[PDB]
Each structure stands twice: as structure tokens, then as C-alpha cells.
């Protein structure tokens, strides 16, 4: 699937690095890669990067 | 005066107005442990909440 694994942001998150992304509640994260229990990789509003896995809820 | 103090371990960007930002080595003073996960305190003139696990207590 072009969007791959997707999820919806539960809370606000501000990237604290160029390797991270940011989102507002209800934003959609796509092409997720669950690389570890802490940080996942994915896309959000044109930005590619890491984010807290616990800040989103998987939803296809 | 500076109450309970700590040093920032990692970079953190406030997600909201109720939160504060800091870089590694920054000092957080007057810490209030209003929760095991989220503390409150002062950093670089700002007051608010931050991840307790992102700082190391140090007096």
C-alpha cells in the first residue's frame, strides 16, 4: 500500500531534531516503520522522520 | 531559592504553552514533581511542564 502502515496522532509533538517530525492531534502518520518500542519512522505532512510510538494510535 | 534543581539530559521541544523547552546541559530550577512522569519547573526564564525522564536531578 502506498501509505503502508498508518496511524493517527493522539497528542501534540514537536520535533526536537532534524531527524524527527511533528504533528497535532488527529494528524495522520503514514508509511510507518516500527523500528523499536520507543521511536518509529514515518511520514507526516510531507515530513519524513522519527516520532514517539506512544503518541499515535495505529489505524488502517 | 532555586529549590530542587536538575540538568537537561536531552533536547525537548514544548508541545504546548503549558510546557517548557530545553537543550542538553540546560538547568531546570524550582522543580515540582506534580507527577512521576511530568515535572514542572523553570528553565531559561520559562515556567511549565517537562518529561521527568529527560532530566537528571542534581543539587
Amino acid at each position: 500500500n502506498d501509505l503502508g502502515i498508518t496511524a493517527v496522532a493522539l497528542y501534540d509533538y514537536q520535533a526536537a531534531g532534524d531527524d524527527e517530525i511533528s504533528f497535532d492531534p488527529d494528524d495522520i502518520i503514514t508509511n510507518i516503520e516500527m523500528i523499536d518500542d520507543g521511536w518509529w519512522r514515518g511520514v507526516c505532512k510531507g515530513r519524513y522522520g522519527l516520532f514517539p510510538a506512544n503518541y499515535v494510535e495505529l489505524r488502517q | 531559592d532555586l529549590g530542587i534543581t536538575a540538568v537537561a539530559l536531552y533536547d525537548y521541544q514544548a508541545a504546548g504553552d503549558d510546557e517548557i523547552s530545553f537543550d542538553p546541559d540546560d538547568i531546570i530550577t524550582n522543580i515540582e514533581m506534580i507527577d512521576d512522569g511530568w515535572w514542572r519547573g523553570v528553565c531559561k526564564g520559562r515556567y511549565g511542564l517537562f518529561p521527568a525522564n529527560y532530566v537528571e536531578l542534581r543539587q
Binding site: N54, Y55 | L9, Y10, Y54
Partner: peptide
């Protein structure tokens, strides 16, 4: 990398 921050209170 650093640990993720806990979900907001």
C-alpha cells in the same frame, strides 16, 4: 537515542 517522552498528563 534518548527515550521517548511519556504521553502528556
Amino acid at each position: 537515542k534518548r527515550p521517548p517522552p511519556p504521553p502528556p498528563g
